[PDB]
From a paper:
A potential workaround to the size limitation in cryo-EM is to bind a small protein of interest (the “cargo”) to a much larger carrier (the “scaffold”) in order to make it large enough to visualize readily. In the present study, we demonstrate a protein design advance that substantially rigidifies a cryo-EM scaffold based on fusion of a DARPin as the modular binding domain to a designed protein cage. Analogous to antibodies, sequence variations in the nonconserved loop regions of a DARPin protein can be selected in the laboratory in order to obtain a variant that binds nearly any protein of interest. The rigidified scaffold described here provides a number of advantageous properties for cryo-EM structure determination—size, symmetry, and modular binding—making it suitable for future applications to many important systems.
For imaging experiments, we investigated three different sequence variants of KRAS—single site mutants G12V, G12C, and G13C—in their GDP-bound forms. All three KRAS variants were found to bind with good occupancy to our cryo-EM scaffold (presenting the KRAS-specific DARPin). For mutant G13C, ~665,000 particles were obtained from 2,000 cryo-EM movies. Following similar data processing as before, we obtained a 3-D density map showing a resolution of 2.5 Å for the entire particle and 2.9 Å for the KRAS protein. Given the cryo-EM density map and the amino acid sequences for the DARPin and KRAS proteins, ModelAngelo was able to build, de novo, a correct and nearly complete atomic model using default parameters (164 out of 166 residues for KRAS and 150 out of 157 for the DARPin). The amino acid sequence was correctly assigned throughout both KRAS G13C and DARPin molecules. As imaged here by cryo-EM, the KRAS protein matches closely to known structures of KRAS-GDP reported in previous X-ray crystallography studies. Our refined structure of the G13C mutant overlaps with a previous X-ray crystal structure with an rms deviation of only 0.5 Å over protein backbone atoms. The region around the bound GDP cofactor further emphasizes the atomic interpretability. A Mg2+ ion bound near the terminal GDP phosphate group is also clearly visible.
Author numbering:
A (entry chain A): 169 to 320
B (entry chain B): 1 to 168
The structure:
Amino acid sequence: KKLLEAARAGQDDEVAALLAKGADVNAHDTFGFTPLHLAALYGHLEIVEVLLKRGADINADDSYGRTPLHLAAMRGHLEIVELLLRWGADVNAADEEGRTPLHLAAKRGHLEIVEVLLKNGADVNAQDKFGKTAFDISIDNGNEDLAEILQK
Amino acid sequence: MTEYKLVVVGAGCVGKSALTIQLIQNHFVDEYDPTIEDSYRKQVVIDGETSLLDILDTAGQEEYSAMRDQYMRTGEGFLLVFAINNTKSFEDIHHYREQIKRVKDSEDVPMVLVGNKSDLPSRTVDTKQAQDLARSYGIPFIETSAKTRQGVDDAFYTLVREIRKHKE
Ligand SMILES: Nc1nc2c(ncn2[C@@H]2O[C@H](COP(=O)(O)OP(=O)(O)O)[C@@H](O)[C@H]2O)c(=O)[nH]1
Ligand SMILES: [Mg+2]
């Protein structure tokens, strides 16, 4: 409980003290958010590194099936995306609607995150449970740069 | 099928995320992150027609978002939520409706007034004020509770019915 609030707020000394005190790294709230989820969502790179080195889980799901990579891609944190990728996070995970992190990044309009996710290796044409792909999302939004990146 | 865009707007800690999760998953979440904004999709049959609804769970206006602006300028139906036990949320409804009308050119924007947290015996806002305001705006008003799930589906179904009226 204290670890979750410390990770959400962005406290380094408090998180380190709680970890040394014995707080579990895989604690979760009612929906299922873990300290890694909150640290990636809010944008605290150092806390993400400390949690990863401590032994946290990098492919943990919430009640909707979203991983920390999903939250990092939907927010727009490039460094956290790269750090999560370098430790073996599933780049082609699916939530309860079967949305790849590429889908979320393309819908938000984060071109650099899209390029990083493509460089790390991810299929462009993946269909969710509603028969939609990233290219279709780009068509619906009408963004020219996203379509240029996807078609190339 | 047809795609209907529904945008949930209101103040903070009024229960927008709780209502959206209650509709999509049929489950009440005790605590949710106050900053997560996301789009959910559901397929439902209203009256005698099946349809698809995509709902944006708005969090706030702290920073500019392209997806949020695109939904605001394109979304057809709007759900204006307020909590019965707080009156500042009730006051903010006028500003929210004015912003929606301004961004959407204010022709015939369909909106539905929603009163959440109606399962608490302590309340500072009564049904008289909310009903009078809704009748002044000419929009339906529905009381909702995310814990007992009363009115959770009725609000969205009334919104889509009002949307059909605008097209017709
Ligand atoms: N008793 C009761 N509590 C509610 C209701 N709706 C929301 N809440 C509580 O309000 C708190 C915050 O609501 P939240 O989901 O964050 O609404 P949001 O800020 O608009 O996204 C949650 O912890 C819920 O327990 C309701 O209908 N009844
Ligand atoms: Mg919320």
